Point group: D3
Chain length 240, copies 6
Amino acid sequence: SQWSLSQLLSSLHEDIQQRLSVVRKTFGHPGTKGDASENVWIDMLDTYLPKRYQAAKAHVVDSLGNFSQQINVVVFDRQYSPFIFTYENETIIPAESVYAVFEAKQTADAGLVAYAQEKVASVRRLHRTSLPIPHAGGTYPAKPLIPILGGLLTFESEWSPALGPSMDKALNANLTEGRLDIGCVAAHGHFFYDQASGAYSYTNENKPATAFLFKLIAQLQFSGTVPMIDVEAYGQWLTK
Amino acid sequence: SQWSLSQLLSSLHEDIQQRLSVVRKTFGHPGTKGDASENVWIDMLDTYLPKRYQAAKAHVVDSLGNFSQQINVVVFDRQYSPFIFTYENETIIPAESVYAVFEAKQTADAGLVAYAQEKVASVRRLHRTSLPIPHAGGTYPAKPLIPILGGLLTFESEWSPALGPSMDKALNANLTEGRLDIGCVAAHGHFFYDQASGAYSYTNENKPATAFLFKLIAQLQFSGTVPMIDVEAYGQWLTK
Amino acid sequence: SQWSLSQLLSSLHEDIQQRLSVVRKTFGHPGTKGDASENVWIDMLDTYLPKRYQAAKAHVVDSLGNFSQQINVVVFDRQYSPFIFTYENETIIPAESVYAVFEAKQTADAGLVAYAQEKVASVRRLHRTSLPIPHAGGTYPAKPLIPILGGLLTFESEWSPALGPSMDKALNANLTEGRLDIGCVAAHGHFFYDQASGAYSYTNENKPATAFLFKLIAQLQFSGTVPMIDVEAYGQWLTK
Amino acid sequence: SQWSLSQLLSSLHEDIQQRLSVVRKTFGHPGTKGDASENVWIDMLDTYLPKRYQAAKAHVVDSLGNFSQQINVVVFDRQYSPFIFTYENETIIPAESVYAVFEAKQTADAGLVAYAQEKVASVRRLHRTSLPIPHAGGTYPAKPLIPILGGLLTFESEWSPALGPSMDKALNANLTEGRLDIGCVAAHGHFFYDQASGAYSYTNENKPATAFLFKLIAQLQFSGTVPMIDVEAYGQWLTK
Amino acid sequence: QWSLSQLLSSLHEDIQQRLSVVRKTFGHPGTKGDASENVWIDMLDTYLPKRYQAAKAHVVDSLGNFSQQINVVVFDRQYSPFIFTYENETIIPAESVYAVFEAKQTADAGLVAYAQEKVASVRRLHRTSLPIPHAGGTYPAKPLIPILGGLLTFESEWSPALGPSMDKALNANLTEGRLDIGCVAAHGHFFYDQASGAYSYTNENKPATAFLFKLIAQLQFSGTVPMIDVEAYGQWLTK
Amino acid sequence: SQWSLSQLLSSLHEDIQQRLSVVRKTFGHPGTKGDASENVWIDMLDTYLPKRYQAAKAHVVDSLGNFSQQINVVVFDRQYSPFIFTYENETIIPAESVYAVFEAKQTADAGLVAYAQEKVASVRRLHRTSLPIPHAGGTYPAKPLIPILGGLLTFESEWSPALGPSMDKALNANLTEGRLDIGCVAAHGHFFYDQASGAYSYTNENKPATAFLFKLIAQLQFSGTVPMIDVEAYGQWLTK
């Protein structure tokens, strides 16, 4: 009956780990298991992230007509950004709306790390517009393009411990367009890329999903709001 | 990744036990903990019971103007029954709509058993009308009044054994208006009253919340649908 | 402090009268005022009628291709009946689904009574199919067609007293296809057509909206469920 | 301007065909296109079927521990049937709840017909319990088991004519556990198995999605409500 | 295989198709109008940035004056209260408004004039504007934003739809009732070019999508609504 | 018929007073009455406040692990702030999210004023972080903390006049950490603390709930958006 902040943060994490564990052992069909697992991560972000952020599955498109791969957990703006197309509950968002790109799967291994790196690169390669921003105090120059964070969300790992030499090799194989900035292995720990030191930081236990959530919120704060989209750049495709 | 019926039933139970456990250790304020605990039990019944059943907190009233105590988990009909009054999300249902009456609290002990028995009695004492029932085949005579099931829902038990002779004593103290027909102690097992043998049956472990849910569904099937309410009996209070 | 069934019934009515009063004096556009008033009546029925009944605005169609007028408050089945067409939140239901037809307007007068009678007649003139009914015991012979109840719902009356000779004259002008069986003038009383005596019964005050609701439920009970629709009769209109 | 029953039925169909056509030409990822297409069919059935039917994706389980394949469009009862397990929006239903099983894909061809027949057979092979049914008039004998309807939903056909001899040969390859009783090829027509004649009936054009919907409703009516489930048979799996 | 051009074409085709079904299927005029408005509101609710709300409403100002009924208004709720909402009908303050549209099935001279009067009925309202507290301190009160006016239809009575007859109708009001943007879903879109002082017309080219993109681009210049002085409304609290 | 701004404001208030009056006389059980009364006030704020404000029941926690009392109506940010924990519909928010704190009860008296003062103090004692704010134009200095508004919401008063010497005495007993800045006695008037004069301002009648709402919105505007939370201060509790 004593309130405890540590207990709140532990329970947030325990809920995520428990739900992912139930999904893993109970749903026999791999597609069903994957859909339910993604549902957990999207629910966590929808529940806890500031409401300036949306979290969903989508494809990303740019004004040059290029498309990302399917992103199973994308974090994006809707306060200042349209969808490009949404129909029958499937969605394509403009590249200018994107804050972060994650690949979610039940188990981390070398193939999944490389797959996530490529998913992230498929978004970062897209072209983003940026217009001068009218506001209450006048007009800002166009905002410089924000970083798009990349990451991986799993329950388990092929490696034990999950965050060891094999994971470190896999992550360090792509520190450029496919760089993963943050990730969570819910049964084991979380990681983030420290730009000041140029290396990954790993934490085992210590409430992994909550640690991931808090690091993501803090990292996202540096991005501010997405730059202002030039929708008329997309409008060039109305005639061709 | 193989499908297992036993795993489905185990996961249903484990989810309930886990949510109640998180509520108990995380919410320091008693009212908050109680409200969250009741939310779990109501969510379980709303999710799994056949849709002919509603589950909610309510008071019960009869056409004699008498009221039950507050029932924190009542199972009732809405397909054939009106509310008597619902306002600002608080609700009063007619006695004729009731299928089952539960008291949900943290731990089973002598005082809670007696309190739950009195809650159930406060509903069974109410008067229920019953009219001949028009249907596709003609008209049935008024349905004989259905039993109202009584029950208790807890996480823990103060007794040792949890479902042992001390519990059996408290339950056998009221086999009439306050009789409890079914109950769940989520950390320990479930019980039910066997009318054929005139005694209680106890089962330890065996996925307690799922075992409770399945027994409740089976017991409810015997009640069929509620008898047909005479709403004009309540209308006698329009001139009073 | 003390529970009172009479108070529950009074408050139910007072809520409806107050909401209609606020709509009447506050919305200065006639269409807005009408829409808001209809919303009150539909909310009352949706909240309190047994869930076997739907309440909404709709047109009604039959398998002979005939359409009713627009019905602003129709009570109908959806448990056993399809929509014929629903699109952009506007709806057409089959005649076999209908239990009751109401016209809602702010004030009762000679023109409104005649208008409501014509609305009801426009539904009663429609053809209703009825098929033998498969059920748990086998197949019942086709259910004989149920009466469709007709009515009016207003707040005020041009006549003072509201339910006097002028109302009785208007109501008795149509006792066949346009007969109104039940009605509520929320600020004054309710009426119903007594088939045994062949005359209207009027009740002033006595919590009019609650009195109306209880009479409507009691009258509807005699209809049971709608007869079983022959959807293939509508399917005759699939040819080019 | 003028109401037309033929137009209502034509617009219902045209809406389905247009939505499926947009999905087909607009979503460039196969999983996304498939999900959106299934969404259209499920939306159609959820919107228009009587509310006694649920329509969703699910797996089916029986009281012998056997599971079906993943069913992308299942029509089932929830008024009288629990879920066996639902978690993170993915669901397993008992075999006793099932009315109809469909496979939904883009184009009809020999492989898809055989795949759909096997999907249906994977449900029909499951064991279904049936108990005596308590009701207002006493207790019915256990209801004899109802057929489960099987079907196929597509947009196009690889064959010319679409519903021609090649389709007929594929359908006639399984008239037992995998028999398809009804199907829709949205751009071309619909089919149904005529038990009296022992052969398939094909209808080209005539508003295919509406014709399919009406035939499905008429077929389903013969099934009445699902027999009463013996949940205690599932409870045998509660033991360690 | 994906195509951005196809996305934009399908967005428009969906709107045109839904409006076409409504027009031919709902025999009752009120039902047809309600369903058509539902399409336009759904399009804007789905695609506009979430800083914009789209609904039917009346507009009121702190001087007690009311607009006509606006069947499609685009307005702020992030920084603005409702003045009154009850039984799902709503009155918004003038300070919340970004854009005012009249939606009907067919464009003709009477509809253009009616839409211009609807827009004027909102622009005549008084809007307050207070200094704005924010993360950096307090901005001076924001100068009042233009309220955009427009029309949304499916068809046109004229040949061509956006031809000389439409141009005459629009040019009859370039002041308080000026329409800045509009869509004739079966034919094209128009906008008022302030630099040249004339209307620009675009035929085909996915009309509803072209309209949506131009609307978003025009709205961006308005930023957020100025900060309402709700206590100006409070003068009507006395007996 | 004629629109009237005066009437809009009168109806807004009259709706609140009517709903609170119905709750007071209709719900016999004190807990039910209190929940329904809180529901009215939360609905009013959720309906009318700008969407940058959330209104709900919650506990508040800070990065030092300290907790407030239970707050039945808190007004807070979610656009830029996470929840710390939300589970089974019960919620804990960070102190940095808070704009205003209210205690809502049916009747004002000396005990309640002191209780509301203690509730507010329990939130104001909490520590609030504030980081430099990234935005479109660069980075702002950390926003200075702004004081949290405190308040009381009731229907009636033990005193007549309600806003008389006894109320003034109770309010002036705490002008520091427990100071109430604004309040409404719905049947009588509203009050606010005038910082310029150092005294309370009382307004009788003048549509109290509307007058309260407008003063609240005006006071809140001065607070702008909450300062930017340092979630890593909370993350210190991940490892302890």
